[PDB]
Design a protein around this ligand. Structure first.
Ligand SMILES: *[C@@H]1O[C@H](CO)[C@@H](O)[C@H](O)[C@H]1NC(C)=O
Ligand SMILES: *[C@@H]1O[C@H](CO)[C@@H](O)[C@H](O)[C@H]1NC(C)=O
Ligand SMILES: [Ca+2]
Lengths: 97, 109, 55, 55
């Protein structure tokens, strides 16, 4: 009945046969839309001599995964969880320059 | 997709794929690696300590006979993205580096 | 000690304790955390680059 | 190869080889290690703090 036990049940169900190396689309032709944003914490340095810019940013990302879905009615009205980001698929967004 | 994750599981199944063994058949044949350097920026030349800094994309191509599959058996999939940390890689490094950074920076798929 | 190691095995048994889960009871109750900072030393204030170092 | 993989899986079989044990037989024999340093480059000699950097 306790929320922790329900969360444990949900975690055990979610990652039963989850593969973090596979793109999370139900159909191969589907595209994963990634909502991308930046949020700058501070402008650390502008090195004019070396032509480099150092910034502290928050890289906000948001996408949909079709396998990580549940009905909150089956898990004590648990509506969202926090899990380590290295257990799931993530987009490989990199800074080019 | 279910088929994609089935294929990824089948290809990387550690029982039947050892990433520390060269993908050479027929005994002692050699694995040919194609190499190509692409330059993105010449970041700096530091004459004082004699070091050049570059941002390069190092294209590598080879053949791994253990990573084959039949498209008709996997929903007609022609290629897949595998993490490069879980397949065999040729240990190609910048041999004349300075500061001892032999390897690449990112390790993309 | 035998009892102490039996207790430590019992508490951290992954079969019944998951460290990725908040210790929340009573449905949607929140976990209260008390915080208190103890300053051991002000190591340096670097005015040039505006950084304070503390232990 | 299948043969190379079989050989590697046979040599390192944890059921009959663990790396925590010195390869010594005959009671108290000692493992002889042959050492040879080959210099790749003398990176720098920093006279101020008396440090030599080598590869
Ligand atoms: C995937 O989408 C294609 C194109 O719309 C369709 O032909 C195919 O039947 C779909 N497959 C599944 C499993 O939904
Ligand atoms: C479930 O919990 C949410 C709070 O996250 C609340 O707004 C909602 O009314 C609850 N529903 C039920 C049926 O308990
Ligand atoms: Ca500056």
């Amino acid at each position: 009945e306790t929320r922790a036990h329900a969360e444990e049940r949900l975690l055990k169900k979610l990652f039963s046969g989850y593969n973090k190396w596979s793109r999370p689309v139900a159909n191969i032709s589907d595209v994963v839309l990634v909502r991308f944003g930046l949020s700058i914490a501070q402008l650390i340095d502008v090195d004019e001599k070396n032509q480099m810019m150092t910034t502290n940013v928050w890289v906000k990302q948001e996408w949909h995964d079709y396998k990580l879905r549940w009905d909150p009615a089956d898990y004590e009205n648990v509506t969202s969880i926090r899990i380590p980001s290295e257990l799931i698929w993530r987009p490989d967004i990199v800074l080019y320059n | 997709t279910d088929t994609e994750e089935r294929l990824v599981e089948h290809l990387l199944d550690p029982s039947r794929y050892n990433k520390l063994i060269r993908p050479a058949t027929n005994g002692s044949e050699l694995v040919t690696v194609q190499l190509m350097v692409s330059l993105a920026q010449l970041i700096s030349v530091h004459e004082r300590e004699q070091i050049m800094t570059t941002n390069v994309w190092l294209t590598q191509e080879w053949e791994d006979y253990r990573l084959t599959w039949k498209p008709e058996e996997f929903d007609n999939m022609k290629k897949v993205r595998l993490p490069s940390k879980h397949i065999w890689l040729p240990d190609v490094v910048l041999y004349n580096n300075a500061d001892g950074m032999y390897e690449v920076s990112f390790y993309s798929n």
